[PDB]
């Protein structure tokens, strides 16, 4: 029921001149937007990516981001000159911004910044702040960034008002895609070293249940791997069971998933 909306920015600064900024946007585990460095405009990756924004509202929003990208790029470059020679290129910066949507018109917005792959800075309330563990030198950038009242007011409106509204509309518009059910297909294999593998692929959404079973006995030696993505926005998972050779017969792989609607997949070795 709870969906997290994530705008993810990746910025690489190799030297004083060369830089690139790339962005992707997620609603839950579905990609809604893409913004390549090479592109002047934000790309929709779904038909419903504009949500319930009118063309005029979207154009105004995109323009704000266009100004931001150019500005952010110059700001980092200038902050590097300002801290010289404490910090140096290359520099990787990541931004994670968005809002978590709760039922009954509740939401929490966030804007987190990582420097060289470490969370250092967030926007909180009405200002930028460092987080615990952040280096002291960041106090000067924070002081400069907090001097810009215009950015502060813009971000506040962006986090407090724009995000929750936009996402509410996204949830309405993308309802059918968010609630789609895709059936998993399973298959079995084995690698002697023996280890039995149960492959489960093509399922959506993410929640799934996979256990190796002898009859009705749950084999506690089952090791669930990570969730791996397919290209078609479905998921892949495998569960491995370590067995003694000769004791194969009797083992089955049971898969429960919401898309099957009661009809569990059972595959006997």
């Amino acid at each position, epitope marked *: 029921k709870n969906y997290t909306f994530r705008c993810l920015q990746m910025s690489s600064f190799a030297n004083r001149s060369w830089s690139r900024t790339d962005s992707v946007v997620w609603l839950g585990d579905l990609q809604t937007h893409r913004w390549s460095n090479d592109s002047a405009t934000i790309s929709f990756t779904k038909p419903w990516s504009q949500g319930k924004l009118s063309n005029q509202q979207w154009e105004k929003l995109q323009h704000m981001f266009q100004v931001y990208r150019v500005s952010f790029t110059r700001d980092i470059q200038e902050l590097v000159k300002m801290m010289s020679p404490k910090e140096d290129y290359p520099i990787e910066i990541q931004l994670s911004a968005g809002c978590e949507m709760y039922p009954g018109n509740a939401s929490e917005s966030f804007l987190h910044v990582a420097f060289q792959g470490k969370y250092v800075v967030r926007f909180w309330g009405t200002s930028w702040q460092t987080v615990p563990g952040a280096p002291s030198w960041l106090d000067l950038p924070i002081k*400069v960034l907090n001097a810009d009242q215009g950015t502060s007011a813009t971000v506040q409106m962006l986090l407090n008002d724009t995000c929750p509204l936009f996402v509410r509309g996204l949830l309405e518009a993308g309802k059918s895609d968010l609630e789609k059910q895709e059936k998993p297909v399973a298959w079995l294999s084995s690698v002697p070293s023996r280890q039995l593998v149960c492959h489960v692929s093509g399922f959506y959404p993410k929640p799934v249940w996979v256990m190796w079973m002898r009859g009705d006995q749950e084999q506690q030696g089952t090791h669930r791997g990570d969730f791996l993505p397919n290209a078609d926005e479905t998921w892949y998972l495998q569960a491995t069971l370590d067995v003694e050779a000769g004791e194969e017969a009797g083992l089955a792989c049971r898969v429960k998933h919401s898309s099957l609607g009661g009809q569990d997949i059972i595959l006997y070795w």
Partner: T-cell receptor
Amino acid sequence: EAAVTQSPRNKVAVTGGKVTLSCNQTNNHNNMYWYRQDTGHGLRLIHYSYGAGSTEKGDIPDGYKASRPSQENFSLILELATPSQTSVYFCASGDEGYTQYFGPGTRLLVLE
Amino acid sequence: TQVEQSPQSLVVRQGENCVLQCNYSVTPDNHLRWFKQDTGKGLVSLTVLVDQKDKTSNGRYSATLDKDAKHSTLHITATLLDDTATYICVVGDRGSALGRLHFGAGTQLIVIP
């Protein structure tokens, strides 16, 4: 209240000669900026500084060198003066805010 | 140049009002400042406009800013001899020291006493 001083206020120099324009500020501002003003143009940024030991190229840095030996002092150095550097030079300082506080200006004439 | 001023120059008689204008293409446009510069002197800040549709006043000086149009005017009411000067429009692209200033070339005003 935040005052900036420039010296000298007026200078006659020869081509190939060395000229140093000095800027002093007692406001404890990190940031200092050198500009030149020429007819038919707005003020154009030559060099700036974010602190002691720091100098940065502006829009038109060619033929100029900058020097920030201390927080108080920002120098503009013309190693080999040319007539094209005949101009009025303005220094400014500021903190983290957007306001720049301008000095009274320096008139430079480079004769052949 | 991203900041253009009009008129280039003008002559008015004491007691008359005049309008000076500034058109810019600076992006972004955090704020706009008007300077008075007496001949052979420094820059005296007259006003700073910051809002989308801003209006300011400073004695006989008043100014408007329209960010949508990227246009500003400075009004001088009841000119005096001492208004004889160059009026310079400056746009700042940031609300902080990370900003660059964009200077107009100015408007020369002469007031005949």
